[PDB]
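Long-time lurker, finally posting.

We've been working with T4 lysozyme (Enterobacteria phage T4) and I want a structural starting point before designing mutants. I don't trust myself to interpret raw outputs, so I'm hoping someone here can both generate the structure tokens and explain anything notable. Sequence follows.
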Amino acid sequence: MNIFEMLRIDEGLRLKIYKDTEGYYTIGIGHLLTKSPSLNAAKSELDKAIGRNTNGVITKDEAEKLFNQDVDAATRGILRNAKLKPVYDSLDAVRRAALINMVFQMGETGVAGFTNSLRMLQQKRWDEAAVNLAKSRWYNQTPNRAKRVITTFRTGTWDAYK
Ligand SMILES: [Cl-]
Ligand SMILES: [Cl-]
Ligand SMILES: [Cl-]
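Top reply, 14 upvotes:
Generated this for you. Predicted structure of T4 lysozyme:
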């Protein structure tokens, strides 16, 4: 397993514009297009992202390409964030993947706000961090996915994805 396969499992793959769990226009492997309620604003962002007139539909290669960009960008954003970088650097490879997963879903800002959990993760208090992570909108809104990520931070293994 690796970050790519992990995200592929959590986000799925859809080739036509769809709405995410929050109601936002997305495509591919969890590539958010816009928070705007307009399908037209979404198709336009799509064409700009792809470099062609898509008419709201992309190929598998294009979805994969967006995904590669988004993972890279997620990871690099973590290294550039003063609150996240130190946590990431302290983690082992498996847990690093868990933190990238949360940043991919919720944005760097969102994650950077889990101050207490980040502190427990850096201290390697796994069970305590698992408990704290769960007291969040994140966990209540997407319980299945959050548990998978939480178990990942707790155990340092990919068991939840097997
Ligand atoms: Cl893009
Ligand atoms: Cl460095
Ligand atoms: Cl879920």
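Before you design anything, note these points.
The pocket of chloride ion (ligand 1) is lined by residues 49 (CB under 6 Å).
Residues 98 and 149 are 6 Å apart (CA to CA).
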